[PDB]
Amino acid sequence: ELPEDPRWELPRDRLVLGKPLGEGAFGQVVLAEAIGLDDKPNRVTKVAVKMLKSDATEKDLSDLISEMEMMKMIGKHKNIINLLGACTQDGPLYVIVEYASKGNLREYLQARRPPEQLSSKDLVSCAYQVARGMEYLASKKCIHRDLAARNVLVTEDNVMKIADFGIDYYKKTTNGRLPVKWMAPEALFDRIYTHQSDVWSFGVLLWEIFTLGGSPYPGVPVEELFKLLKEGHRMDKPSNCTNELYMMMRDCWHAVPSQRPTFKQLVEDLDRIVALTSNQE
Amino acid sequence: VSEYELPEDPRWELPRDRLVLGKPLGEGAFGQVVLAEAIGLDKPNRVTKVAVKMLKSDATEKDLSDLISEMEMMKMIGKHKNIINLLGACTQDGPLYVIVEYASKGNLREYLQARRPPQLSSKDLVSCAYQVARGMEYLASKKCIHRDLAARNVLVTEDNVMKIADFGDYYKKTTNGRLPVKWMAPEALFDRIYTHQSDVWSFGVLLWEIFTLGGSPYPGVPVEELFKLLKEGHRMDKPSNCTNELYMMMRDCWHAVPSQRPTFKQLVEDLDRIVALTSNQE
Numbered sequence: 209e210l211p212e213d214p215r216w217e218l219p220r221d222r223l224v225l226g227k228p229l230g231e232g233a234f235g236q237v238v239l240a241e242a243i244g245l246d247d248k249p250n251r252v253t254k255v256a257v258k259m260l261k262s263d264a265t266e267k268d269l270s271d272l273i274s275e276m277e278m279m280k281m282i283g284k285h286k287n288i289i290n291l292l293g294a295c296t297q298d299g300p301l302y303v304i305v306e307y308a309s310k311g312n313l314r315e316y317l318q319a320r321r322p323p324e325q326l327s328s329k330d331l332v333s334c335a336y337q338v339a340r341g342m343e344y345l346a347s348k349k350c351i352h353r354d355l356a357a358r359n360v361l362v363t364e365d366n367v368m369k370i371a372d373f374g375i376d377y378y379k380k381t382t383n384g385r386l387p388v389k390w391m392a393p394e395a396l397f398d399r400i401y402t403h404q405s406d407v408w409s410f411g412v413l414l415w416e417i418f419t420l421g422g423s424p425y426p427g428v429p430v431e432e433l434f435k436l437l438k439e440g441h442r443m444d445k446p447s448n449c450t451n452e453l454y455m456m457m458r459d460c461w462h463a464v465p466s467q468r469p470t471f472k473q474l475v476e477d478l479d480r481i482v483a484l485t486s487n488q489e
Numbered sequence: 490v491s492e493y494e495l496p497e498d499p500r501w502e503l504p505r506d507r508l509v510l511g512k513p514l515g516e517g518a519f520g521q522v523v524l525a526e527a528i529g530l531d532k533p534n535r536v537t538k539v540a541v542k543m544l545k546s547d548a549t550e551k552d553l554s555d556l557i558s559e560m561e562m563m564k565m566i567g568k569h570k571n572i573i574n575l576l577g578a579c580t581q582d583g584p585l586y587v588i589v590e591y592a593s594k595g596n597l598r599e600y601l602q603a604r605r606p607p608q609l610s611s612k613d614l615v616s617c618a619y620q621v622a623r624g625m626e627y628l629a630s631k632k633c634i635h636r637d638l639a640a641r642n643v644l645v646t647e648d649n650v651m652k653i654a655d656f657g658d659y660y661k662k663t664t665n666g667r668l669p670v671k672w673m674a675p676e677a678l679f680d681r682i683y684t685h686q687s688d689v690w691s692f693g694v695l696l697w698e699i700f701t702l703g704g705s706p707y708p709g710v711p712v713e714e715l716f717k718l719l720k721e722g723h724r725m726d727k728p729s730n731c732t733n734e735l736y737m738m739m740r741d742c743w744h745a746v747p748s749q750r751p752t753f754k755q756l757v758e759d760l761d762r763i764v765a766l767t768s769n770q771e
């Protein structure tokens with residue numbers, strides 16, 4: 209049995225499960241409809257539901273509870289996937305969260321590549337939102353550890369929402385990419401995970417945005433990536449990316465972690481650049 | 490026959506006392522290259538600063554054969570401004586010295602690297618591409634396929650003139666530590682078919698090298714992984730400070746179907762037009 213929390217608990221008869229969305233962290237994610245989440249008790253809200261797979265262990269359960277328990281503490285923000293409720297009693301654990309219909313930022317940016325289109329201002333606005341979301345998480349003393357476009361979900365209203373916050377190097381993703389390519393060197397070589405190692409990952413995410421879902425270091429294996437980092441190599445400036453925005457990526461990848469910008473600084477600069485970026489191209 | 494004596498060609502032959510050897514320039518193809526001074530090449534008493542290619546002391550009868558062949562080919566190919574031309578030779582009574590034009594500003598890659606901002610204008614960069622294409626178009630008309638067209642094999646003269654050099658194993662790297670497979674067309678790299686259209690692809694990689702101001706192609710990418718990129722039909726990212734017309738030209742050179750790539754005559758025509766429309770103000 210799991211303990212009951214009435215602040216969040218939803219009766220199972222108020223949740224109609226739909227088509228699966230795909231595999232998530234610590235379990236699988238399905239589309240659902242929740243009858244009366246707030247008044248109105250008669251309104252349906254389209255939501256996302258995470259539960260365990262049939263092959264899951266007592267360890268996989270504890271992980272899912274822990275993530276839910278953390279979301280309770282972290283609190284609400286527009287640019288994070290928020291908790292909406294849970295079915296913890298009389299059956300399997302269903303963690304009810306916000307639903308993002310346009311998938312992950314990688315897929316979204318890829319699907320909108322030229323032969324719907326995004327202007328330069330729209331791309332800067334994507335970076336702004338992720339930084340706003342990360343700055344909130346940082347204020348809650350939370351370190352993501354895997355900030356990438358794949359872990360940023362886009363809603364129907366093009367709002368960016370950071371997913372699964374708070375590992376073998378030769379383990380690839382579903383799309384066949386290597387997650388080591390997003391890691392700060394100190395996290396990779398010294399296993400030191402800080403808000404400053406997440407800032408390095410935001411630098412890789414920025415590159416991902418301005419390349420419209422480009423794969424970082426294509427054809428580069430793990431042993432060769434270490435060689436690039438040790439040599440102090442940095443990714444080439446994307447085409448259709450300002451010198452101010454490349455300067456920003458390079459600051460995020462400052463060799464010295466203490467010399468990198470913070471998320472509060474990134475939010476400030478990105479706010480200013482959005483305002484000065486034309487929506488005419 | 491060439492073991493004891495080489496045949497004489499008086500159209501090119503120079504007396505050895507008319508050549509004063511100087512500081513070595515580096516290792517070249519089929520031998521080594523040294524700086525030299527030739528007393529009266531034309532007509533008389535004037536010294537011309539030249540480049541001299543000869544064999545290393547450890548060279549074989551096969552290495553000699555190769556050097557003679559390159560000289561013999563240069564005799565056939567004829568003169569052009571955008572190629573390293575033959576000036577003469579010492580073939581008799583001592584080791585073979587192949588006397589050629591001298592390019593003081595080194596190779597295009599080093600040239601472009603040394604001139605990176607912390608200068609060459611956009612028009613200067615397009616002019617580099619134009620010259621290489623003019624040089625390759627001349628070589629193509631002479632039924633010659635380079636097989637290793639890269640910035641490293643393009644010499645730049647005192648007067649900034651581009652000159653193609655040494656015009657004809659996958660895990661063999663260069664002196665600067667780069668992999669030459671990163672310049673070859675897929676047909677040359679899988680079916681071993683080397684054509685003028687293969688040199689058009691290598692010109693595509695050279696153009697990328699120019700607009701990245703001596704950028705290293707696919708950094709940290711090994712050979713087996715490069716094949717995977719080519720088979721997947723991956724194409725290098727558009728460089729920063731490179732027009733969409735110039736990137737599309739790179740992409741045209743990088744066409745999977747060799748017959749659908751532009752020829753050097755087309756490249757010369759388009760570049761001629763672009764140089765004229767490119768501002769020297771930036």
Ligand SMILES: COc1cc(CCc2cc(Nc3ccnc(NCc4cc(C)no4)n3)n[nH]2)cc(OC)c1
Nearest residue numbers: 229230231232237256258289303307308311371372
């Ligand atoms: C901390 O953030 C989360 C995020 C999630 C992901 C829920 C989700 C899926 C979704 N929409 C889409 C769109 C396209 N493809 C998918 N696939 C499933 C998926 C995405 C992610 C991220 N994890 O699983 N979901 N929006 N919101 C679940 C969760 O449960 C404890 C907490």
Ligand SMILES: COc1cc(CCc2cc(Nc3ccnc(NCc4cc(C)no4)n3)n[nH]2)cc(OC)c1
Nearest residue numbers: 514515517522540542573587591592595654655656
């Ligand atoms: C078919 O084209 C050639 C090109 C050459 C290149 C000779 C050369 C070198 C040179 N100037 C410099 C300047 C700085 N560093 C070097 N390095 C030697 C070098 C580079 C390359 C390429 N070949 O030799 N050469 N000017 N002309 C020789 C030759 O003799 C058979 C035939």
